[PDB]
């Protein structure tokens, strides 16, 4: 499972589980900013990785540049977006017949994930856990090209409800996607004491999506 | 509260504080990993340790070391963080002057700082050291370790391998008058990925047994 691949700033370290099935969808999992202790082994990041793995995806989580054994210097976002595109290119190189992808990102990783979504038409679903629309600029989502899940806590002081609600309201004006927006009572930015609750919602969301629900009629 | 700011040697230290409902309640201080491994006071294992002591009636504090979150100052190899932990313990004790006992629980780098605080502070009668790194940080100051406690590590840990943890535990087990409870969790890495429930169950069982007067040697 331990892998090293090349990104624009040098080596990027990752954890990789190929699907046992042919042409399986790919999931890329993206971690928080190091100011909030983000790495590919944060529990929420690991649990996201595990959720996709258990549902038969080819799955990759990885450390952004400067984190762990990943080379380079952390930057405001452009480099990390480039890292994420490199990581997806790498898994796709190994799985050329996977035709679809999901991205799941937590905190800063949700911002990078939604930027990747905008650039990569094969990404047909996303999860954005605790996005920070008062800290990072999400106006590039116009329109958001895919249905997905936004999940945040009502005790979050880093990215408050009012801010997440404004982003979701803007997205919900876009015909042809469904934004599933769950707010968890008592969850802070780190979902302290609420990780099981968070992961059960992400699991339910993915199961319903794999059943063909929670997207509009095309 | 529970959000608190108190003064450390390097400036402001940010914490989360839950006082006990009870009188003379013991104090628990919870210490987080190094920032290279994403350590903050809100790491899930750190939070769960905090919540364990909270639920068992302890006055409980977790906090961010200097440079982490809103805590001021620059991170250093360990001396500063030990000073931070001492300041943190002094602060809680200033608010709870009738508490006569304390536990420290630390994860990774936090376990090394925790055991150093244990060595300095006679009121500390128990500890938990989750994923200690005796191949990276020097534990040889434990001479002897003054209290019984729990060391818990995983057998898939590549940061601090089993052999290294076992060597520290074997050294401590030569010291009479304490009991080192050492659990090795199958399949757990340094981050207990997919094993946090298992880890926290073992921590809970250990504290429950210790509060029942078990897992410490007889008075003799
Ligand atoms: Cl974590
Ligand atoms: Cl921005
Ligand atoms: Cl928060
Ligand atoms: Cl050292
Ligand atoms: Cl490890
Ligand atoms: Mg339909
Ligand atoms: Mg006895």
Provide a compact summary of the structure.
The first copy, chain A, has 218 residues and is of the alpha/beta class. Chain A has helices at 43-54, 78-94, 108-119, 161-171, 195-210; strands at residues 2-7, 10-17, 26-30, 58-62, 101-106, 123-129, 148-153, 179-184. The complex binds chloride ion (5 copies) and magnesium ion (2 copies).
Task: State the shape of chain A.
Answer: globular
Q: Which molecules are bound besides the chains?
A: chloride ion, magnesium ion
User: Treating each run of at least 4 consecutive H or I residues as one helix, how many helices of chain A?
Assistant: 5
Percent helix of chain A, as a range, is: 25-40%
**Helix/strand order of chain A, N-terminal first:** EEEHEHEHEEHEH
CATH architecture of chain A: 3-Layer(aba) Sandwich
Q: Beta fraction of the residues of chain A? A: 15-25%
The quaternary structure here is homodimer
Q: How many domains make up the coordinates of chain A? A: 1
Give the helix/strand class of chain A. alpha/beta
| Biggest β-sheet strands, sense, barrel of chain A | 8 strands, mixed
At the first level of CATH, the class of chain A is Alpha Beta
Biggest interface between chains: A-B, 19 and 19 residues
Computed over alpha carbons, the radius of gyration of chain A is: 16 Å
PDB class: structural genomics, unknown function
Keywords: structural genomics, hydrolase, PSI-2, Midwest Center for Structural Genomics, mcsg, unknown function
Assembly: dimeric
Entry title: Crystal Structure of Protein of Unknown Function ATU1826, a Putative Alpha/Beta Hydrolase from Agrobacterium tumefaciens
């Amino acid at each position: 499972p331990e892998v090293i691949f090349n990104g624009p700033a040098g080596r990027l370290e990752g954890r990789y589980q190929p699907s046992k099935e042919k042409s399986a969808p790919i999931a890329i999992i993206l971690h928080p900013h190091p100011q909030f202790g983000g790495t590919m082994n944060n529990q929420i990041v690991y649990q996201l990785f595990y959720l996709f793995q258990k549902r038969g995806f080819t799955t990759l989580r990885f450390n952004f540049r400067s984190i762990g054994r990943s080379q380079g210097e952390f930057d405001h976002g452009a480099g990390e977006l480039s890292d994420a595109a490199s990581a997806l290119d790498w898994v796709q190189s190994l799985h050329p017949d996977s035709k679809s992808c999901w991205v799941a990102g937590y905190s800063f990783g949700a911002w990078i994930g939604m930027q990747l979504l905008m650039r990569r038409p094969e990404i047909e679903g996303f999860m954005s856990i605790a996005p920070q629309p008062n800290t990072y600029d999400f106006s590039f989502l116009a329109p958001c090209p895919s249905s997905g899940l936004i999940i945040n806590g009502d005790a979050d002081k880093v990215a408050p409800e009012k801010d997440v609600n404004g982003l979701v309201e803007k997205l919900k004006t876009q015909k042809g996607i469904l934004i599933t927006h769950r707010t968890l009572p008592g969850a802070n930015h780190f979902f302290n004491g609420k990780v099981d609750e968070l992961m059960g919602e992400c699991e339910d969301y993915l199961d319903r999506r794999l059943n063909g629900e929670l997207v509009p009629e095309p």
